[PDB]
Amino acid sequence: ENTQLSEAYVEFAPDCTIDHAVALKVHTAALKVGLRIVYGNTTARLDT
Amino acid sequence: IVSTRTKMNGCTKAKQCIAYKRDQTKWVFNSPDLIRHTDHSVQGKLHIPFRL
Ligand SMILES: *[C@@H]1O[C@H](CO)[C@@H](O)[C@H](O)[C@H]1NC(C)=O
Numbered sequence: 001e002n003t004q005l006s007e008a009y010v011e012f013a014p015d016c017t018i019d020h021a022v023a024l025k026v027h028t029a030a031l032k033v034g035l036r037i038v039y040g041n042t043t044a045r046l047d048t
Numbered sequence: 049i050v051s052t053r054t055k056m057n058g059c060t061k062a063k064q065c066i067a068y069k070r071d072q073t074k075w076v077f078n079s080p081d082l083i084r085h086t087d088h089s090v091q092g093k094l095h096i097p098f099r100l
């Protein structure tokens with residue numbers, strides 16, 4: 001008549017908060033460029 | 049239920065009989081070595097010291 005029931009599951013460890021890694025889906029590489037342009041001792045810093 | 053009293057029951061064999069020194073006054077951290085009380089209720093929490 002005795003019976004025993006056991007159960008098991010899992011969760012992220014407490015230290016996970018800083019040891020976690022992430023999977024990323026990337027696409028559509030886009031470029032941003034910073035330029036310095038000088039014309040007739042007229043300097044300009046631009047980014048585009 | 050017997051308080052400060054020795055008591056008897058019909059079935060003379062004292063083996064199958066079961067007794068508790070139960071107090072049900074303190075909360076404890078879940079551990080495999082300890083049977084689960086029928087309440088199986090989450091009553092409180094605690095933090096873990098010395099975080100990262
Ligand atoms: C740039 O050069 C011109 C002459 O070529 C001069 O008149 C002007 O003062 C100069 N500007 C600076 C900021 O040096």
Ligand SMILES: *[C@@H]1O[C@H](CO)[C@@H](O)[C@H](O)[C@H]1NC(C)=O
Pocket residue numbers: 051052
């Ligand atoms: C056992 O508990 C009951 C209910 O609280 C109480 O009336 C009785 O006096 C207690 N007996 C003890 C502590 O010996």
